[PDB]
Structure formats: structure tokens, C-alpha cells
Write a protein that binds this ligand. Structure first.
Ligand SMILES: [Zn+2]
Lengths: 69, 49, 497, 49, 49, 72, 50, 288
DNA sequence: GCCTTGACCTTCCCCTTGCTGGAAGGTTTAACCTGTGTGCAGTCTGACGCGGCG
């Protein structure tokens, strides 16, 4: 289903945004979660560039920096 | 006195009336509602009403 | 049976959550029992402390005793205050004059000096030595207990036993964890000697192949028994009678302990009655009810039975004071101590009658007259009388937005004035470049620019050199250099800053 | 809504049935309410407030 | 234009020097949220790069 | 003794007595554990002496010396 | 600060232990005054314009 | 500013301490005219840091001149008032308590772990039914529910030889007791027998849950609260407006009452009073 | 521009009578009186979980 796919997500923060943040972060902090910051929203809240638009061209540089530390 | 003055001035029925035009007054007092206590709510309420 | 019915009810609590139900449906179990509950519980409590104070006497180890405390307080020639009022004081079944005390504190000395000699009369437990024990006791049993000071007399046992006991535990910590030992043999053998390690060979006579491996820790084991034995030398009496007196008065205090309980459970319903009579909405139900329970504790924990009244009323007003304080200490995040509180109370007690007999609100001067006290107090009272109003109140017509939006951060900066101040600084040091290096530098430091701290006249001097007044005249020099209506224009607008 | 006594008929909310749900209610100017109603499986039930 | 403080001040000072440049940081409402989670018994944190 | 009873017996008030004790003008009265200044018949007559001493004209100092006289 | 300190060391002007609370016209508004009303407690002196 | 990733886990008492600066000890805030924070109240600058930019409470230290320095009159350190935001507080408790989220959401995530109903656990912590810690004797078992009369019948049957209790510390020690590991491998293989719908699902979620606890490094011990953190003040302020009236982040109220009852408990702690009323106070805490 | 050089001022703390008034902070009274509640809340509701219960 649509909304359940929104909730049932790889990451948790955009999931933690808008619809029952409670259960999200409960089942997250028990689990030792960590998101790896490739969603848009994920880069919105920090205010960093999106991995996208104009910014994909730099986010790819960041991605090969993730490869090259 | 507490009860009565609270009603006459902090109920959501008393309002600062409309000093635009005469009809504004006469209609604003010739209003009817089903909001507030013993009443309804727009989200609770539907279309038939 | 209420537990019989609490059984079913708790079996089918309809997912109820309120501890009001829990506490009240629990304390409803035990009913009222008074009017001889009061007096028999009283006789039991006083019998508890009676057998305590009976136990207290005949003291071999608690050598510092009421005669000592009475000389310590009589060390500086005088006292008739409360700490004597606890002392011996035979009630004829209350300030104490010298001669009466000096008498009552004397035949006890006689019983001691005639008693301490027979302790060695063919043993601690001789017939006539025990006669002087029991007779010293009987000499005391006409008298009563003595004050909370006596607490430390009990402590002088515990802090010994706490130590002695601990050493045994310590010895066991050294004896019992590393190697194996028996627990049917160790007991009676340990009880056997109590003085020398003769139970060592007696226990090991079974030849106990683990007992052959008594090495590498014995230098600790025997040195932990050394601590117990040196405490035994310090005591000077081996312990079975001190244990007797201890558990005697220990049940003696537990007596009063558990006896005062059923008085706790006697009168809980008056407590809730009053708390709900005052839960006219000061704070909340339960905390009030609980302060009332402390109410009932201290009411019972001191009670005079001799008066012949009902316990409950004595208790009642004690409870009233406890809660009627605790309402007023707390119940505001602002602290307003009690004196202001009762001022406000009586103020309004007068205000109600001014409202009637005027039909109209009061005036500060009128109730100042009626109260006979001055204006500005009333002013600052009414300034202070009011309470805070909840950051997130709904100031909108609907939930439009609460009060938070309508608040200013009137604290931090103006970016305009920040940049303006940076510009002030820029222009100022630009000018300081334009004046003498000596004057400019020495004035940067004299006014504290270019560093953290501000030097002064003589200190700047004796850094530079000893001068005082030509330093002032150097200041005037720099003023003339700056006054100079060609360079002012970088600050002739900061004139207006 | 006035006081007195009102009736109504809900439209088979166990729409497995597609069946009527008659129910009746009183309303005072003050006090407690009362609700009478039929279940789908042919039995009366009642509830105050 | 909303939250970060160093940036807003710096850039004000800079465009007054005709500089159309940026120097970002991190917002404040974010760290607010961090504190308001850590209140709830939570070892939220951030990984170094 | 009861400190108010004593101050009314000597006519003074408690802070007067305390002021005088601050100035070391009498025998020291003890407290009680609750903190009540243990006055006395000794302090009774010391305070009555120190009372009439200044009404006569003896200051804090010479009236303290008069209570020294009595205590001598 | 040492620099405002410096300016008021140069010219030596001061501030009193009072400041202003002048009511003013909000921005952009302009107009005509046609009435004033003042209220004062019962007991305080009614001043000159009062 | 820069960083890689977000990281979440359960928090230890040790680390809630490590974050904090000093513990609070009383509920008050300020005077009613000399609007000045107290010691160990809620705005005490000692722990949270100073009040203005580098000024002490009395005015001893000022203007950055003594940077890493303290007015030990009050005991407030010379710093900016910028750290109103940051320096959280901490609190220690008498008896720990349970976090409502870790059960009272839908599925508990903690009682579920132990296959246990919610209602039993409710009856425990609102002090309605005892339970066995663990089976000392062979008669009775772990997770074995006890009502007080039944508790007692078992007691007079044995006396000392078992471990039974009502309250949370019971549950604390319980979840401390178990091991993820062997139960995980059990429920893994136990799947095989009846891998119908129900047995499979239940064993599934449990196995996954256990492994989650393992490999995250998280812990069941930390499920509940021997400690509590205090939020800094400016996030929860208490300030006047023009008319002379204060306004209060209502949170403040939610805090302050709690503290006082904690210390009330520490009063009664000196007494070994009837544990009934003590239970009343515990209930009151958990509710608050 | 280096030095005092003497001699004058202003401020700020601290001191000397004989107390007084104020603020904050404590502890006990014997006639008594024994299970709330107290105004909610008007039932929104469809999808979806899951507990018990067949
Ligand atoms: Zn300070």
C-alpha cells in the first residue's frame, strides 16, 4: 500500500516526519539504526545540498569521497 | 459575579460588533448558529445539516 | 472480607488506572478501631519502650551512661534546660532543680560502686553479682526512659556490633570464599572457644585434605581474626549478654513500631475527609492526602495517653498544620513564604465583608485603616499576588496561534548596530595609526584596547616609567592631537552613535 | 437539538447484512442520557451516556 | 533568512561590501530537536566523516 | 529563663538584651537546644543594674564595668 | 566597550540615570490629532496638563 | 557543521550523566522580587552556566576578564549566556521507573519480548499482583504471577526459598537475567516443528528482535530509568511580558511536582514506614 | 619632550553612639468530627491490529 510503503522505508527520518513518528523512532533506537543521507528530505533538514538538481554534480563528488574517504 | 462576567466577555458567543454600517449591526444580531456548547463542530458535522 | 472482594475486583479491574481507586479501595479494607484500640495500642507501645529501658540498664560495655551525660552537661556549673527534662525524672506514679537531681543521680552511683565490684565475684554471672545486676535494674525500673541523647548510647552498641559483626563477616570473607569449609562443623566449634584458635585443630582433626592446603592467604586470614581479637581486648567482655540486651530492646522498639502502625490504619478516613474538605482547588488530591498521612505518623509517634481524650483530635490539628503549610510552601513555582500568604488570606477575609457592607470593591486606604497597616505593602502585594499565564495559551479566536508568536527576543543584537560597532572599531584604529605610537599604544592599553584587561595610571606608568602627572598631560596631548577638526569626520557621525 | 425523545434507523453498518438498525434516544435539558437499540442479531441493547 | 545566525550576520556584513557570497553552518531548530529527543532517554548523535 | 518574661521583668526587649550581650555587657546566658537564651536571677540583676546604669548616665562601657563590679 | 569608552573619553558627555519612554507615531502613519484623554488614580496628584 | 551520518541507540545512565553538568536537588526557581535563580532550583546558573555574557550571580567576575573562573560565592562559572541552549541537567531517583513508550505503544517491545501480557505487567507496576523473580525452588517458575494472598500461601509453604516481588525492580532484574543468545537459537530451530502461520510469525519477530538487541549493542537493562535528564531552561522558559506578568512553559509545572515527590520519598525512606503508603507514592511518581 | 614638585580635590570604603525595624525561617495547642466522584462526555469514523474467544 501507499502510505504503508511511506512508513515502511529504508530510512526513518522522512518516515519520522509526518505520520506516527513515535513507532518509527521506538523501533529504530532499539535497533541501532543509522541513515546514510541520500534522501532529499534527509539533506533538507540539515540544509545541505540535495543529491540532486544542480547538486547531483557535487553530490557525486561526495559519493566518490565516500568511496575515497 | 465571576461566572457571569466570564460569560459576558469570554464565551465565544460575545463578539465585538460591527461598526461598519447599520445593517451590519442589525444582521450581526440577527444571526443564528449551532456552534459552541450544546452544539456541533464543522469536522464533526456533515452535509445534511 | 475485603481481600476476598478485592480478589474479584482486581481480577476484573475494567482497565482502571486511577491510583485514587487503588489507595482508597485498599484503605477501605481496614475499618475503624478506637476507644480501646487507642489505649491498648498505647499500653503496648509504652510496654515496648518499657522493656527497652529495662533492657538498657546493667551496662558492661556501654560504659558512658546517663551519669556521664549528666556530669558532661553539669561540666560548666549550670543547666536546667530541656536536656535534663529528659533525664531520670521519677514521675509521681518540668524544670529540674539542682538538689533533687544531685540526689536522684547519687544512689545510682551507689548501686554502681557496689555493683561493679561483684562482677568479678567468682564470675560475671554470680548469684549476688546477678542480684546487683537485677537490683540496679529494679532501681532503674521505677524510673523512665531518657531523651533522644540516649540514641547515641544505642549507637555505641551498634557501632561496636557493626564493627564486630563486620569482622566476623570479614573473617568469613577471608575464610569462606577461597577454600572449602564445613557449615555443620564450623558453627558449633566456633561457638565452642570464642577466645583462641583451638577450634582450628579440633576442626582439622578430620584431616580435611583441603585443610592441608591452608597457604598463601593465611597471612590475611589470621590477621582478620586479629582484628576481631583486638576488638575483644578493647571491649573487655565477651558477648552473650550484650546480644541479650540488644535483641531485648530490639523487639522492644519493633513493638512500638508495629503498634503505631494499626494507629496509622486507624484513622485514615478522617485524613481523606479533611484533605477533600481542603481539596477546594489548591493543588491536587493525593499529595495532600499523603501529607496527612505524615500527619497521622507524628501524631501517634509522641502521643500522651494520660489525658483520657480521643487520640484523633490531637492528631487532627497536627495534621491540619502540616498540610496547611505544605499547600503554601509549594503550589507556586514562585516561592512566597508563609507570612505573605496569611497576609493575603486575612486581606481577602476582610475584603469579603467590605464587599458586602459596601456593595462595592474596596479601596487601599480603607482596608489599610481597618487592618491598620500602610499603603505600599498593599501595592506591592497586589503587584505580587498574581500568577503566571502559560506560554502556549490560545490567544487566537480559535486555535489560530498561541501566545508564543507574540513574543520578542529582546535580548541579543542588532545586525545594524553590530556592523556599526565593527565600523567604529575600524575607524578608531585607523585614527590610532595616525597618532603617536607611544600615545596610541599606551592608550590602547590604558583603555584596555588590544587586550583583555584595563591598566590604570600608575601601572601603565611603572610599566613605561614612574611618571604620574605628565602621564595625564600625555592624555591631554593625545586629546589635542585628536581634537583636530580634520580627523573627527570618521567619528563626527559616531558623534551621533 | 431540542430535548425530548428522538428515533433513528442506521443503514446496516454490519453491511454484511444490509439490514436496518433501529434505535431510540431521549435527551433531557440536564442530567443523563439513555440509548435503546437493536443489534443486528435480533436482541435489544441499552446504554446510558 | 530563517535560522542560521553566523551566516545571516556574515552575509549582511558582506553584501554591504557588495559581496553576494554565502558561508553556511547548521540550523538551530535541528539542534533544538536533538535536545528534545535526548530528554527522552536517547543516545542520538552524529558520525564523524 | 523565658526570654520575653525576662525582658518584661527588666522592661527591655529581647534585641536590647542581645545588643548588650553582643557588647559583652553581662554574664553569658546559655541557650537551650532549641536556642532559647537561658537567662537567670544572675542575669535578672545584671540586666536591672545595666538598665538603670544608663538611665543614670553610664554608657554601654562603664555600665558593663558596673556589671563587672557586681560580678566582683 | 573600550571604543565607546574612547569617544566618551574624548568628548566627555554622559547619560543621566534616566532614559526616555517616548510614545511615537508608528511607521508610515501620518495624521491629525483632535482629542486627548487622560486618566489618573484617585489619590495621586493630577499634574499640569492633567 | 559537517558530518557523515545519524546514529541512534538506547542511552545508558553513565552517558546521561556524562552529558550533564551537575544534579538538581530542589524545585524552586527564583525570588518573588529579586528575580534571581537559587541553588539547585531550575535556573541555577552553576550547572546550566551563567545568566548573561560573562557575569556571575553577585557581579564578582565580569567582562571575560576571568574566563575559566567561578564566583564561588554562588559557584557560577564565567562564560557566555549562550549555553542556555545546551547544558542539560540530570537527576537520580530512589526506585527506577518504566518508560511508557516501551510498552504502552502497540506491541510492547518489552513485555512482548518475554511473551508476557500487558495486563500482568500493569498489575505489577500499579502494585496489584506479585510475581516470581526466578525459581529458587522446583515448585514454581519464572514469570509466575502471584497475588498477595497466593504469594503468602506460597510463602508460608516455603518462606525464604524463592524470590517473589511486586514492583519494577523485579522486572528490572528479570530482564537483566535472561540471555538473548540461546533463546534465539532455540526459537530459530523451534520454528521448524509447526511453521504454520502463528508459530512462525511469533518466533520470527522474536528472533529478529533478539538479533537486533545483539548486533546493535543495545540492551534490555537500559529499558528503564534509574536516571532522568533535565532540559535546559531557554528551551522551556519562564519570562515576563510588558504588564509585569510572568508566563510559564507549562513543562515547568510538569517538571517541578515530580521532583518534590522524589524527595518526599527520601523523607519516608528514613522511616521504614508502612510500605502501603510508599506504594502510593511510587504509583504517584510513575503516573507523573 | 624627559622628570618630579608641592599641594589641592573628588570619590569610595570603613569607622565611632543606642538601638530600632524589617525579613526569612522554625515549633507546638487535647471537645469532636473517619470511602471521593461532581461534572466530564457527547457518542466523528474508516482502516487497520490484535486479544480474546469459537
Ligand atoms: Zn557569582
Amino acid at each position: 500500500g501507499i502510505t504503508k510503503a511511506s512508513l515502511a522505508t529504508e530510512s526513518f527520518i522522512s518516515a519520522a516526519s509526518f505520520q506516527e513518528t513515535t513507532r518509527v523512532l521506538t523501533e529504530a533506537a532499539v535497533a541501532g539504526k543509522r541513515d546514510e543521507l541520500r534522501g532529499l528530505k534527509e539533506n533538507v533538514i540539515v540544509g545541505r545540498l540535495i543529491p540532486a538538481g544542480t547538486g547531483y554534480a557535487y553530490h557525486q563528488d561526495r559519493m566518490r569521497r565516500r568511496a575515497a574517504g | 459575579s465571576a461566572a457571569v462576567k466570564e460569560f459576558f466577555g469570554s464565551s465565544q458567543l460575545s463578539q465585538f460588533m460591527d461598526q461598519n454600517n447599520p445593517l451590519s449591526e442589525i444582521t450581526h444580531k440577527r444571526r443564528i448558529s449551532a456552534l459552541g456548547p450544546g452544539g456541533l463542530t464543522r469536522e464533526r458535522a456533515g452535509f445534511e445539516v | 472480607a475485603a481481600a476476598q472482594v478485592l480478589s474479584s475486583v482486581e481480577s476484573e479491574i475494567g482497565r482502571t488506572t486511577d491510583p485514587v481507586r487503588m489507595y482508597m479501595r485498599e484503605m477501605g479494607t481496614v475499618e475503624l478501631l478506637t476507644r480501646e484500640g487507642e489505649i491498648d495500642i498505647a499500653k503496648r507501645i509504652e510496654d515496648g519502650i518499657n522493656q527497652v529501658q529495662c533492657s538498657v540498664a546493667e551496662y558492661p560495655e556501654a560504659i558512658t551512661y546517663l551519669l556521664e551525660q549528666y556530669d558532661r552537661v553539669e561540666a560548666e556549673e549550670a543547666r536546667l534546660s530541656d536536656l535534663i527534662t529528659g533525664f531520670v525524672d521519677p514521675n509521681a506514679e518540668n524544670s529540674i532543680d539542682p538538689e533533687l537531681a544531685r540526689e536522684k543521680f547519687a544512689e545510682l552511683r551507689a548501686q554502681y560502686v557496689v555493683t561493679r565490684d561483684t562482677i568479678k565475684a567468682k564470675g560475671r554471672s554470680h548469684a549476688t553479682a546477678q542480684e546487683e545486676i537485677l537490683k540496679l535494674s529494679e532501681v532503674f525500673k521505677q524510673f523512665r526512659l531518657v531523651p533522644k541523647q540516649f540514641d547515641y548510647l544505642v549507637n555505641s552498641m551498634r557501632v561496636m556490633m557493626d564493627r564486630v559483626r563486620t569482622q566476623e563477616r570479614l573473617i568469613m570473607k577471608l575464610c569462606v570464599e577461597q577454600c572449602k569449609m564445613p557449615k555443620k562443623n564450623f558453627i558449633t566449634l566456633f561457638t565452642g572457644n570464642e577466645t583462641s584458635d583451638t577450634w582450628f585443630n579440633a576442626a582439622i582433626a578430620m584431616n580435611k585434605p583441603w585443610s592441608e592446603k591452608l597457604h598463601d592467604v593465611s597471612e590475611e586470614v589470621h590477621r582478620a581474626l586479629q582484628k576481631l581479637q583486638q576488638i575483644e581486648e578493647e571491649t573487655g567482655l565477651t558477648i552473650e549478654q550484650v546480644k541479650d540486651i540488644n535483641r531485648r530492646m530490639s523487639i522492644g522498639e519493633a513493638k512500638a513500631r508495629r503498634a503505631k502502625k494499626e494507629m496509622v490504619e486507624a484513622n485514615l478516613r478522617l485524613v481523606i475527609s479533611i484533605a477533600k474538605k481542603y481539596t477546594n482547588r489548591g493543588l491536587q488530591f493525593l499529595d495532600l492526602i499523603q501529607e496527612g498521612n505524615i500527619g497521622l505518623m507524628k501524631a501517634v509517634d509522641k502521643f500522651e495517653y494520660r489525658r483520657g481524650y480521643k487520640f484523633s483530635t490531637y492528631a487532627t490539628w497536627w495534621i491540619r498544620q502540616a498540610i496547611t503549610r505544605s499547600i503554601a510552601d509549594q503550589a507556586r513555582t514562585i516561592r512566597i513564604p508563609v507570612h505573605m500568604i496569611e497576609t493575603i488570606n486575612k486581606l481577602n477575609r476582610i475584603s469579603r465583608q467590605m464587599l458586602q457592607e459596601m456593595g462595592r470593591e474596596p479601596t487601599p486606604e480603607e482596608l489599610a485603616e481597618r487592618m491598620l497597616m500602610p499603603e505600599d505593602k498593599i501595592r506591592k502585594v497586589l503587584k505580587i499576588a498574581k500568577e503566571p499565564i502559560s506560554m502556549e495559551t490560545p490567544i487566537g479566536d480559535d486555535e489560530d496561534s498561541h501566545l508564543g508568536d507574540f513574543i520578542e527576543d529582546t535580548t541579543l543584537e542588532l545586525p545594524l548596530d553590530s556592523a556599526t560597532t565593527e565600523s567604529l572599531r575600524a575607524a578608531t584604529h585607523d585614527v590610532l595609526a595616525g597618532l603617536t605610537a607611544r600615545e596610541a599604544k599606551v592608550l590602547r592599553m590604558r583603555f584596555g584596547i588590544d587586550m583583555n584587561t584595563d591598566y590604570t595610571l600608575e601601572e601603565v606608568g611603572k610599566q613605561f616609567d614612574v611618571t604620574r602627572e605628565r602621564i595625564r598631560q600625555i592624555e591631554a596631548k593625545a586629546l589635542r592631537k585628536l581634537r583636530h577638526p580634520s580627523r573627527s569626520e570618521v567619528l563626527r557621525s559616531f558623534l551621533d552613535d | 437539538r431540542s430535548p425530548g425523545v428522538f428515533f433513528d434507523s442506521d443503514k446496516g453498518k454490519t453491511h454484511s447484512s444490509g439490514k436496518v438498525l433501529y434505535n431510540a434516544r431521549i435527551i433531557p435539558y440536564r442530567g443523563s442520557w439513555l440509548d435503546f437499540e437493536f443489534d443486528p442479531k435480533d436482541n435489544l441493547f441499552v446504554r446510558i451516556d | 533568512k530563517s535560522d542560521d545566525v553566523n551566516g545571516r550576520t556574515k552575509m549582511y556584513k558582506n553584501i554591504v561590501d557588495g559581496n553576494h557570497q554565502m558561508e553556511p553552518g547548521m540550523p538551530e531548530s535541528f539542534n533544538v530537536l536533538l535536545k528534545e529527543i535526548r530528554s527522552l532517554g536517547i543516545n542520538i548523535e552524529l558520525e564523524d566523516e | 529563663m523565658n526570654i520575653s518574661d525576662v525582658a518584661k521583668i527588666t522592661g527591655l526587649t529581647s534585641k536590647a538584651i542581645r545588643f548588650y550581650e553582643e557588647k559583652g555587657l553581662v554574664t553569658p546566658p546559655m541557650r537551650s537546644e532549641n536556642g532559647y537564651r537561658t537567662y537567670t536571677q544572675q542575669h535578672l540583676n545584671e540586666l536591672t543594674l545595666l538598665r538603670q546604669a544608663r538611665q543614670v548616665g553610664f554608657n554601654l562601657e562603664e555600665s558593663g564595668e558596673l556589671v563587672n563590679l557586681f560580678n566582683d | 566597550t573600550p571604543e565607546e569608552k574612547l569617544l566618551r573619553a574624548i568628548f566627555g558627555e554622559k547619560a543621566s540615570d534616566v532614559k526616555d519612554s517616548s510614545l511615537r507615531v508608528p511607521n508610515g502613519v501620518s495624521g491629525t490629532v483632535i482629542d486627548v484623554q487622560v486618566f489618573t488614580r484617585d489619590g495621586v496628584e493630577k499634574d499640569k496638563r492633567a | 557543521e559537517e558530518f557523515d551520518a545519524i546514529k541512534i541507540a538506547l542511552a545508558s545512565p553513565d552517558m546521561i550523566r556524562s552529558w550533564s553538568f551537575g544534579e538538581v536537588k530542589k524545585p524552586e526557581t527564583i525570588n518573588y522580587r529579586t528575580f534571581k535563580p537559587e541553588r539547585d532550583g531550575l535556573f541555577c546558573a552553576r550547572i546550566f552556566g551563567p545568566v548573561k555574557d560573562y557575569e556571575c550571580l553577585c557581579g564578582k567576575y565580569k567582562r571575560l576578564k576571568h574566563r575559566g573562573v567561578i564566583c564561588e560565592k554562588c559557584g557560577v562559572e564565567v562564560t557566555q549566556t549562550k549555553v542556555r541552549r545546551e547544558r542539560m541537567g540530570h537527576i537520580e531517583l530512589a526506585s527506577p521507573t518504566a518508560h511508557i513508550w516501551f510498552l504502552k505503544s502497540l506491541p510492547s517491545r518489552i513485555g512482548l519480548l518475554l511473551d508476557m501480557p500487558l495486563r500482568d505487567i500493569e498489575r505489577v507496576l500499579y502494585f496489584e499482583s506479585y510475581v516470581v523473580i526466578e525459581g529458587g525452588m522446583t515448585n514454581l517458575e519464572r514469570q509466575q504471577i502471584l497475588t498477595e494472598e497466593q504469594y503468602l500461601d506460597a510463602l508460608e509453604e516455603f518462606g525464604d526459598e524463592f524470590d517473589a516481588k511486586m514492583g519494577a525492580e523485579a522486572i528490572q532484574a528479570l530482564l537483566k537475567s535472561m540471555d538473548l543468545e540461546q533463546e534465539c537459537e532455540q526459537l530459530r530451530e523451534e520454528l521448524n516443528e509447526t511453521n504454520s502461520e502463528t508459530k512462525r510469525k511469533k518466533l520470527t519477530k522474536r528472533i529478529k528482535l533478539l538479533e537486533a538487541f545483539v548486533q546493535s549493542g543495545n540492551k534490555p537493562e537500559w529499558m528503564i530509568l534509574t536516571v532522568l535528564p533535565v532540559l535546559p531552561p531557554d528551551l522551556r522558559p519562564l519570562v515576563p511580558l510588558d504588564g509585569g506578568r510572568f508566563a510559564t512553559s507549562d513543562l515547568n509545572d510538569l517538571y517541578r511536582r515530580v521532583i518534590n515527590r522524589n524527595n518526599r520519598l527520601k523523607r519516608l525512606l528514613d522511616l521504614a514506614a508502612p510500605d502501603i503508603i510508599v506504594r502510593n507514592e511510587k504509583r504517584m511518581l510513575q503516573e507523573a
